[PDB]
Amino acid sequence: QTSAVQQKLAALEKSSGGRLGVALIDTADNTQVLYRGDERFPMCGTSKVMAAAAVLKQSETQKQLLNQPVEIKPADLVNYNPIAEKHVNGTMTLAELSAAALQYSDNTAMNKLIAQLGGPGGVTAFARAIGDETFRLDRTEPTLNTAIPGDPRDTTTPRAMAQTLRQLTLGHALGETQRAQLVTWLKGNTTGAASIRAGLPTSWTAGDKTGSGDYGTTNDIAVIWPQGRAPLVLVTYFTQPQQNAESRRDVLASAARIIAEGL
Numbered sequence: 001q002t003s004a005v006q007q008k009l010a011a012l013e014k015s016s017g018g019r020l021g022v023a024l025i026d027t028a029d030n031t032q033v034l035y036r037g038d039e040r041f042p043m044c045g046t047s048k049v050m051a052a053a054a055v056l057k058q059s060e061t062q063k064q065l066l067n068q069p070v071e072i073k074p075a076d077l078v079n080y081n082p083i084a085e086k087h088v089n090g091t092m093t094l095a096e097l098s099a100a101a102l103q104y105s106d107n108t109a110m111n112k113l114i115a116q117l118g119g120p121g122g123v124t125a126f127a128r129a130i131g132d133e134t135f136r137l138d139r140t141e142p143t144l145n146t147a148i149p150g151d152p153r154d155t156t157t158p159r160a161m162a163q164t165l166r167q168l169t170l171g172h173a174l175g176e177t178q179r180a181q182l183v184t185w186l187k188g189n190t191t192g193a194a195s196i197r198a199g200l201p202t203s204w205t206a207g208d209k210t211g212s213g214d215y216g217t218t219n220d221i222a223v224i225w226p227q228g229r230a231p232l233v234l235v236t237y238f239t240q241p242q243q244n245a246e247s248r249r250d251v252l253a254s255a256a257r258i259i260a261e262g263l
């Protein structure tokens with residue numbers, strides 16, 4: 001069946017010229033709303049949540065892991081390193097790297113998280129351990145953002161990512177302390193005001209992780225606390241036909257608005 005909300009999302013997609021994927025979980029009743037929910041999309045930076053969460057999982061059995069120093073060398077710098085560049089020829093702890101990857105989307109920090117997990121396959125292995133059979137990380141930064149249409153590398157589906165984000169932030173995929181840390185990091189994100197958040201009533205609070213890549217790929221995944229009701233988990237993925245397409249965070253805001261108005 002096609003719902004009123006799905007019809008509005010289809011209209012939005014049509015006017016956007018691209019391909020939109022949406023997955024909402026309303027924890028008030030566990031109901032879901034999906035649009036292209038089982039189609040694959042390039043994750044880009046939204047994959048940083050899985051990497052940080054995997055390191056948080058490791059920290060459950062190593063109390064000092066998050067304080068472990070990691071060397072940052074000039075050769076480690078990639079295409080976007082707002083935090084790591086300050087620490088070249090020095091070190092950053094795994095907590096510092098996690099916070100930089102999540103809150104500033106630092107790509108060198110993400111690479112250190114991936115390395116700590118034994119490579120992209122280590123991130124995928126953690127996804128499998130928490131019941132996500134869909135997620136796949138295949139490359140490091142910056143190539144994991146090529147976002148080529150039809151390419152399965154570094155992709156997931158909106159349904160899978162929403163389920164995983166719910167388990168990580170509201171469920172028991174991580175220990176209580178680690179879940180709280182992840183939520184704190186997401187709520188402190190600096191990059192999300194133009195995306196899902198721009199489509200929500202101002203009174204609502206949220207934590208999110210954005211992503212962008214080639215093909216005008218523009219993504220956001222969020223955990224939301226609406227005024228007067230149980231939290232929501234929302235994933236909005238968007239990708240376009242031309243490699244050099246411009247970002248469209250406004251499309252994510254529009255999708256979020258349709259979802260909020262549809263509650």
Ligand SMILES: CC1(C)S[C@@H]([C@H](NC(=O)Cc2ccccc2)C(=O)O)N[C@H]1C(=O)O
Binds near residue numbers: 044046210214
């Ligand atoms: C500036 C950021 C905050 S960081 C960046 C990052 N993507 C890239 O570096 C690849 C790329 C390749 C070609 C064009 C754009 C991006 C990611 O997905 O985390 N995403 C932005 C965001 O989330 O708003």
